[PDB]
Amino acid sequence: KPDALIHLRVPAEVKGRWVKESRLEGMKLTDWITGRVEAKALSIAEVLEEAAAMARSLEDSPIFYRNKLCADGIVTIQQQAARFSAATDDATRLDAALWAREGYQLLSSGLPDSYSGAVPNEGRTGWVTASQMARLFGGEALWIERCQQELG
Amino acid sequence: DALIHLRVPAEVKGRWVKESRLEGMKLTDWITGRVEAKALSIAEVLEEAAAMARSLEDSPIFYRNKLCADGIVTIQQQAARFSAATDDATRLDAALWAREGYQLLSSGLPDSYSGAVPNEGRTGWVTASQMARLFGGEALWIERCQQELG
Amino acid sequence: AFERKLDPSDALMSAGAWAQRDASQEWPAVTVREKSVRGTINLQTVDVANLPSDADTLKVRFTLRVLGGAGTPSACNDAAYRDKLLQTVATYVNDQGFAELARRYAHNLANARFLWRNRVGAEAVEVRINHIRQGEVARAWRFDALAIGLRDFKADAELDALAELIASGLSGSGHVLLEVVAFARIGDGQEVFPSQELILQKSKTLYSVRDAAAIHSQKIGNALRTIDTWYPDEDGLGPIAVEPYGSVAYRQPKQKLDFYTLLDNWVLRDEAPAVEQQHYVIANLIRG
Amino acid sequence: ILSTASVLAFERKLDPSDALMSAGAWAQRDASQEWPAVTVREKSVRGTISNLQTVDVANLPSDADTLKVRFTLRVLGGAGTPSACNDAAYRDKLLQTVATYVNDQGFAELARRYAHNLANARFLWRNRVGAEAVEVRINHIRQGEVARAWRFDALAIGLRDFKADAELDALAELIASGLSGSGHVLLEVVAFARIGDGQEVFPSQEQKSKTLYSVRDAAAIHSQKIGNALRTIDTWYPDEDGLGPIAVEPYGSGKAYRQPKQKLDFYTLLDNWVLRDEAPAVEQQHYVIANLIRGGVFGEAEEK
């Protein structure tokens, strides 16, 4: 792939202090900021916890009983998510994470495609929650490739 | 105002944009907060401590004695009081109080187990270890709270 | 009348990279696959549509043509009735004009409401609308779908220009043809949402044209006709789709505000409806 | 007919000392003398919201990241010889039985497992968990000066299965020589656990509840607790022997593993071994002599 560029407009003192700390840490500035953002940024493990929390929130919402696909996906995200924290074998984790989105995919394929009025009642459509879950997991190929790279 | 130019792969930028949109902030502000990270945050420390307190709460160590249950409830209560605060004084008192809850739990925990490795549900040693790493030393945590909030 | 006046097309989907959308003709179409998904602790089957791993934006393209002569029916009615119906529609067009309906139609075109679920969770949505005459484009419009509201009709120079063009189409002064492209920056390799078809095994089959994902024309028309803010006792609530009974937020038949009651009282009893309600009547006349 | 002694007691053969605690810096552990002792203070702690409990707390100084826990373990000979008995025939037969074991086996296995529990720093009951690195120094002190030294990575050897090691087998052989009767052995055992700059250390226990144990205003693990950690040797209990070793108790004590229904308990084994001349499995021979080495008051309060 080709690389991409990111431009940071920050106060002058912030840039000077970052340059000082980076020179102290023995790395190039871009690498320093990259490691510092990655460290705290996100977790593969963390995502499942969230997605399960949103699924349990949906469980007490009308979208849970719209059709079998939504309920099955919610229950699956939780079930598989739980399985994932039981540890001691990365093989299962790789399986549980792929299952996790697989449950999500089920929920998103069970969600409606049209609503009435101006804005959807989030309880009856769950589109924003599904958007958040799609952001958490990412693309199908992206999430699968991440899981195979991390837990391969 | 000054600018910094970042050479990163496209996948890294895509992941960063996804996380930024997820958290509801712009990319520059997001990465700025990440680069002024400073590892653990007094608030994230208390939040993780409350999570660990809940995980121990739904287990047998919760019913071992009054010290363990009181410590669990105290950690959670003080984290909740810290998050819903408005003045740095209440935040400071809540953080100190929260550790006092960890200390109560840790002095209520057993000192011996049976078998090779301890059953975490009945001993709670690994969870207490992780939250003790979160808080740090007693004097260290008190000094940190007094520097940040005092 | 029951002859469709706002005739849309199926909106075909394609995938590409944002900021490369200016040359979007080459963009490969979004394919719909049929995957197996693991169920609750067991393999169900579902249709799924995704973008390639190197594409972050969805191009949804359709063609909408606006035709004139709304009051002229298609059913061979008793001529005496049709004379009065045509007279009523003509007196409306003279007195009021299509300006309000056309502006609201152009609003629903520009806000990208036709991207029913594809609009939510998108980083940025942009609508290009080209008035096409002959084999080339007569005029061009570019809109920020998220910037313009989804519950607000406000005046804008370029949007009022599109409104005037749609009014030219509806008035009968010549049928107008628009190509409508929507670019939604949904996310590198994310999920796109084509129209669903209830499978009455497969659970719910996705709609596709020539191995390309698409939103059905009826759904685009439903999105287009979210015009009426004249239903009883709901100011802040956004417009709903124009139906005869206005079911969903509903124009109850008992209330004189229903389409059939109003139209019959207007043409037969010569009782002119409310000004706001006139549009509702001619709007579902345009719907067909 | 031979009957078990009405009174039969044994004396501790693996005699440990109280393990004194001190605090220091990791990179100074080679010169670990004079390290200030970890003191136990009593702090006041606030509890639940509906109020001040008081608890004993032991912490390292704000400038110390490593805990030094030091004790002295002395190995004595003569395991089978009781301290109080009242049947000459039973004690004679018991001496014959234990002598036949010591001849055939020689304490090698038990000594290897005891040296494992010394080297893994298992005696650091809670101080071992959450430690960045734990290291065990073991010196075979003779005159008052070291005769041989051992350095071990407590986390590397773990706490799940006794494995053969070149340096550890030397300590095992020394402990076996001590137990055999070829000379009492004296070892000083120091453990360095990098538990964390200013963290909490955990001495043995027993308004305020659960007061911490201290000797001469210094935090310490009780000798009995160290002995409990030392004898987590038995991997021979009747079910699930792979899940790890437990401590050697008469009924394997969380119900009893060595149940007198499976007959594998200490008392049944010893009775069948001594009185009836039907020696158990070699492994159980290890178990019987292990709780003989531990010492206690066994015997029959009422005839069988």
Curated annotation (Swiss-Prot), chain D:
<dbReference type="GO" id="GO:0051607">
    <property type="term" value="P:defense response to virus"/>
</dbReference>
<protein>
    <recommendedName>
        <fullName>CRISPR-associated protein Csy3</fullName>
    </recommendedName>
</protein>
<dbReference type="Pfam" id="PF09615">
    <property type="entry name" value="Cas_Csy3"/>
</dbReference>
<keyword id="KW-0051">Antiviral defense</keyword>
<comment type="similarity">
    <text>Belongs to the CRISPR-associated Csy3 family.</text>
</comment>
<comment type="function">
    <text>CRISPR (clustered regularly interspaced short palindromic repeat) is an adaptive immune system that provides protection against mobile genetic elements (viruses, transposable elements and conjugative plasmids). CRISPR clusters contain sequences complementary to antecedent mobile elements and target invading nucleic acids. CRISPR clusters are transcribed and processed into CRISPR RNA (crRNA). Cas3 and Cascade participate in CRISPR interference, the third stage of CRISPR immunity (Potential). Involved in crRNA production or stability.</text>
</comment>
<comment type="subunit">
    <text>Part of the Csy ribonucleoprotein complex with a probable stoichiometry of Csy1(1),Csy2(1),Csy3(6),Cas6/Csy4(1)-crRNA(1). A Csy3(6),Cas6/Csy4(1)-crRNA(1) subcomplex is also formed.</text>
</comment>
<dbReference type="InterPro" id="IPR013399">
    <property type="entry name" value="CRISPR-assoc_prot_Csy3"/>
</dbReference>
